[PDB]
């Protein structure tokens, strides 16, 4: 008689008595194990009985004995997989049973599971869990796991740097490798580490607990290994004063990486304060306030932005950092290399910050080119490029491209109500800006000792905004009319709903201002329309001015001067 039959009979007898007497079943199992110490079935049955009895110590001992003696049984592999899945009431009991086994046994089981793993993601997760549980094994596994994850990400051909394997490597594998003092890595590998960490951080924040703090800590660790966001910039400026004047790879790597990191942090803060969606929008403009008359100041009210000081300081810091990056040759070349290595599309927020910085700088042709790029990539909220082109064109004395940009600016702007300003994208602030721009264009068009009169009419009509500030401007215009005596503007009575203007124009027609020949119609008729026009005093001045802008869109022919 074969011993297999006796073992099967003993197991069946023990199993049948389990529902009746647990002690009898345990005694039968012990007797069977004593008779046949090499029987894996008896050990498996004992382990199952112990697990069903919620006995942590007995189940752990039985599992360890089965693993040590019979590792080829698929039941052991299934149990190990179940335990790993639970680790990654029953789950708590399984976790407690895991602690019963020795640390070396647990490490060996984890290594066997990793070796038997097939999926790359599952194997990486198991290895990361094992390293977290047992840091001593991360010395010879941390670098390899990260390299394998990077290779798999490259092979998978991920269009965006937002990858599950890359995310796991950056969140867990990278800090574990960095903090491992026993693990030695070259500075060239630290370069790739910091590159990928920065890419992950900026891609996550642009689109978790604190990507910015983690990136800053990683940068500090990388800088210390090779040995606020504002003080480090000035310290690095002093370092440049000690290094830029005269391989020196550490200094150049720092002056590129740390400076671009602080630049990106400040830039994100800036483009999150202004246009908060890309993270009412705020547009940095040049609003000429004195129409009726390097280290620059951004004038912004504290009501539209309650935290203007910190945002302006961040903008200044980022501008200085970027200026330092392109100032000297080596850092400029390395910065261009790393930036073109990344996404050349420049996203949206970085492009917006670049356009704002260029407009701050003083060069506006490059600003206009960058805004064309931004518009191609892309008053409502989105139409910021129109306002920015308007101010940029007005900067270089164009005075006509400004005018078409302003006229197209308010085509999508319907609502019944120099100095570098910063206004929202709402009508209350934008519409005065557009009217100021148009008034400036026509003020420089009309006061030129020429015979133009439509220019003077356009100055008069657009002088209705913000009265009585245009008092002296309108008085000078009326003096010019008196000198000329032949004012001609057929549109005059369709837009000039100002009682001061109307009663000054009716003064010109009797005796004492001189009988000025006013051609304001396209004897009794002139006064008849005036009696009608004084009834229009009270209508929304913004509405009639906008109607003048849109309907009488032939302002351009005069503005070409």
């Amino acid at each position: 008689m074969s011993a297999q039959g006796d073992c099967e009979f003993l197991v069946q007898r023990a199993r049948e008595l389990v529902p009746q007497d647990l002690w009898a079943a345990k005694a039968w199992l012990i007797t069977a194990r004593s008779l046949y110490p090499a029987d894996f079935n008896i050990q498996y049955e004992m382990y199952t009985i112990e697990r069903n009895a919620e006995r942590t110590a007995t189940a752990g001992r039985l599992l360890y004995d089965m693993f040590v003696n019979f590792p080829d049984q698929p039941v052991v592999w299934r149990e190990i997989s179940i335990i790993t899945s639970a680790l990654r009431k029953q789950t708590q009991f399984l976790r407690s049973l895991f602690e019963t086994l020795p640390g070396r046994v647990q490490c060996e089981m984890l290594l066997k599971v990793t070796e038997q793993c097939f999926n790359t993601l599952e194997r990486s997760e198991m290895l990361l869990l094992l390293l977290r549980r047992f840091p001593e094994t991360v010395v010879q596994h941390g670098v390899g796991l990260g390299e394998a994850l990077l290779e798999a990400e490259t092979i998978e051909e991920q269009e965006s740097p937002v990858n599950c394997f890359r995310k796991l490597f950056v969140c867990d594998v990278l800090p574990l490798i960095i903090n491992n003092h026993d693990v030695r890595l070259p500075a060239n590998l630290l370069y790739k580490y910091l590159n990928k960490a920065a890419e992950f951080y900026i891609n996550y924040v642009t689109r978790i607990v604190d990507p910015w703090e983690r990136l800053f800590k990683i940068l500090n660790v990388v800088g210390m290994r090779c040995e606020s966001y504002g003080d480090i910039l000035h310290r690095m400026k002093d370092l440049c004063r000690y290094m830029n004047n005269f391989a020196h790879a550490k200094y150049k790597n720092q002056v590129v990486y740390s400076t671009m990191l602080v630049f990106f942090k400040n830039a994100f803060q800036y483009v999150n304060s202004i246009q908060p969606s890309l993270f009412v929008p705020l547009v940095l403009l040049e609003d000429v306030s004195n129409v009726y008359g390097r280290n620059r100041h951004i004038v912004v009210n504290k009501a539209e932005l309650a935290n203007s000081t910190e945002v302006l300081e961040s903008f200044k810091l980022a501008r200085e950092s970027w200026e330092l990056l392109y100032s000297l040759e080596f850092l400029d070349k390395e910065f261009t290399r790393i930036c073109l290595a990344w996404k050349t599309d420049t996203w949206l927020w970085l492009r917006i910050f670049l356009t704002d910085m260029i407009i701050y700088q003083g060069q506006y042709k490059k600003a206009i080119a960058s805004l064309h790029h931004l518009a191609a990539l892309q008053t409502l909220e989105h139409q910021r490029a129109l306002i920015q082109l308007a101010t940029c064109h007005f900067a270089l004395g164009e005075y006509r491209m400004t005018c078409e940009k302003v006229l197209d600016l308010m085509c999508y702007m319907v609502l019944p109500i120099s100095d570098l300003k910063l206004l929202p994208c709402t009508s209350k602030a934008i519409m005065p800006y557009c009217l100021h721009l148009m008034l400036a264009c026509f003020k420089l068009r009309a006061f030129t000792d020429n015979r133009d009169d439509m220019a003077l009419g356009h100055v008069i009509v657009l002088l209705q905004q913000e009265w009585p500030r245009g008092e002296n401007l309108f008085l000078k215009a009326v003096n010019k009319i008196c000198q000329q005596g032949n004012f001609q503007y057929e549109n005059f009575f369709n837009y000039v709903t100002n009682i001061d203007m109307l009663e000054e124009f009716a003064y010109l027609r009797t005796q004492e201002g001189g009988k000025i020949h006013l051609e304001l119609l396209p004897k009794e008729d002139f006064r008849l329309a005036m009696e009608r026009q004084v009834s229009r005093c009270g209508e929304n001045l913004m509405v009639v001015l906008h109607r003048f802008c849109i309907n009488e869109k032939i302002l351009l022919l005069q503005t070409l001067t």
């Binding site: 008085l475 009682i499 009663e503 000054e504 003064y507």
Partner: protein, 485 residues
């Protein structure tokens, strides 16, 4: 008088957003307000002269000063809309017409029916207010009217909101250069007709309510009305600064013959007219009134009736072409406004005198009271500033010396005057020169050889040249020279 300066610029032809009713221009609201003001001032203030001045780019006088309020009512609907606003020219024209019609002391209430648009430039209100106030020059700002005026500004522009969005400090300053004599009137709430009528009712109560009084002569009483309403008077700004108005009850205290009062300076002349408190000619026209009896007796006897208008304030009532009426004049507030009558509180009945001061047959009168100190034209002063005076004095001295001893008293009086003046001026050289002239005149005595003439002349010459030395013999001021017996 009353000048109704009303804006006709284009600013006043603006339709008003009045709910319910049709759109009225602000000119129409002004016309209605002035219409109700003229109705009140023709029913209860019928004796007032009113002139309508319309201003725009230039000032114009529609109707001259008249009591024909139907003429002024007609003009309100017969106006044009000349555009541009100029207020300084309007005020210049107001001053011109006021001074060319009434003079320089008759009060004139100016009702400026403005709009609040102020202006834009040149002759605008802001420009002329900022510049000409501190510029002076030939073209002075005619705001402090050269007459006791009261400038009311009926700014019909919504509440003081519409005045505070653009400018109201300009108008409130416009009142201030009139020494605060005025009142800004603004249409409370919206511009509905009821509110403009309320504003003009406030104006009517403030400026055009008749001054009803009571006229008493002991028990003989009369309910009267005094036109114009007397203006408050202030004695000075250091002792008695508060303004004192007259008493509501005019208390006749006595009568003074119109020749004894002569021509008294007065503050202002007023017209006393009885009131009832063809009906007016049949019910109230038959009950005997005291003003009619007083006027008849004053006109016939030729007297006045001194009136107590208050503590230490006194007046007068008299009679009056041919149309005569009872009239009343305010003397200056004080214990003694008329120095020829003494203190008005020292005037009493003739029954308390010993004799009859006015005479048994009325050939005397206690008035006028001679002053205590005679003025220089009543005494004999000695002015020697111009040489003519001194020459006349010495020539009068010598001329009476020839007539000596016939005219000896006048001669010695004149010589005493000369010596007193010379001593009080320290002009002793004149004294010695005059003594030498007396000697020369003595040398040229006529051949008749009057006995006393030589003695008196020689004695006077001796006294003169003894007093010329300055010693205490006759240089004393009171040591008058005495002749020789």
């Amino acid at each position: 008088p009353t000048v109704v300066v009303m804006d006709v610029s284009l600013s006043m032809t603006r339709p008003v957003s009045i709910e319910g009713s049709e759109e009225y221009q602000r000119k129409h609201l002004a016309a209605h307000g002035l219409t109700m003001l003229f109705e009140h001032m023709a029913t209860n203030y019928k004796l007032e002269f009113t002139a309508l001045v319309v201003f725009s780019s230039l000032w114009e006088l529609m109707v001259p000063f008249t009591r024909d309020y139907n003429t002024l009512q007609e003009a309100l609907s017969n106006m044009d809309d000349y555009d541009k606003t100029c207020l300084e020219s309007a005020l210049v024209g107001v001053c011109n017409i006021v001074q060319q019609e009434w003079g320089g002391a008759i009060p004139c209430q100016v009702v400026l029916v403005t709009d609040g648009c102020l202006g834009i430039g040149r002759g605008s209100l802001r420009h002329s207010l900022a510049t000409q106030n501190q510029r002076s020059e030939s073209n002075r700002f005619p705001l402090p009217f050269p007459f006791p005026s009261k400038l009311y500004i009926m700014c019909m522009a919504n509440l003081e909101e519409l005045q505070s969005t653009d400018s109201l400090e300009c108008l409130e300053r416009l009142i201030d250069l009139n020494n605060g004599e005025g009142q800004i009137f603004t249409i409370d709430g919206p511009l509905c007709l009821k509110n403009v009528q309320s504003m003009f009712g406030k104006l009517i109560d403030l400026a055009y309510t008749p001054f009803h009084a009571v006229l008493k002569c002991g028990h003989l009483t009369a309910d009267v009305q005094v036109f114009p309403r007397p203006e408050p008077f202030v004695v000075d700004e250091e002792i008695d600064p508060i303004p004192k108005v007259i008493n509501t009850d005019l208390e006749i205290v006595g009568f003074i013959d119109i020749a004894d009062i002569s021509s008294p300076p007065v503050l202002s002349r007023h017209l006393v007219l009885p009131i009832a408190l063809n009906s007016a000619n049949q019910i109230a026209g038959k009950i005997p009134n005291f003003c009619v009896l007083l006027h008849g007796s004053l006109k016939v006897e030729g007297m006045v009736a001194i009136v107590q208008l208050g503590p230490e304030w006194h007046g007068m009532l008299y009679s009056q072409k041919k149309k005569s009426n009872l009239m009343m004049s305010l003397f200056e507030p004080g214990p003694e406004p008329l120095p020829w009558l003494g203190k008005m509180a020292q005037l009493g009945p003739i029954s308390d005198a010993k004799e009859n001061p006015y005479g048994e047959d009325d050939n005397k009168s206690p008035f006028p009271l001679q002053p205590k100190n005679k003025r220089s034209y009543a005494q004999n002063v000695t002015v020697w500033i111009k040489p003519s005076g001194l020459q006349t004095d010495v020539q009068k001295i010598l001329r009476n010396a020839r007539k000596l001893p016939e005219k000896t008293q006048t001669f010695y009086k004149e010589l005493n005057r000369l010596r007193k003046a010379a001593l009080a001026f320290g002009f002793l050289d004149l004294l010695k020169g005059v003594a030498d002239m007396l000697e020369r005149e003595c040398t040229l005595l006529p051949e008749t050889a009057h006995p006393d003439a030589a003695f008196q002349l020689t004695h006077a010459a001796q006294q003169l040249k003894l007093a010329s030395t300055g010693t205490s013999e006759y240089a004393a001021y009171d040591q008058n020279i005495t002749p020789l017996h």
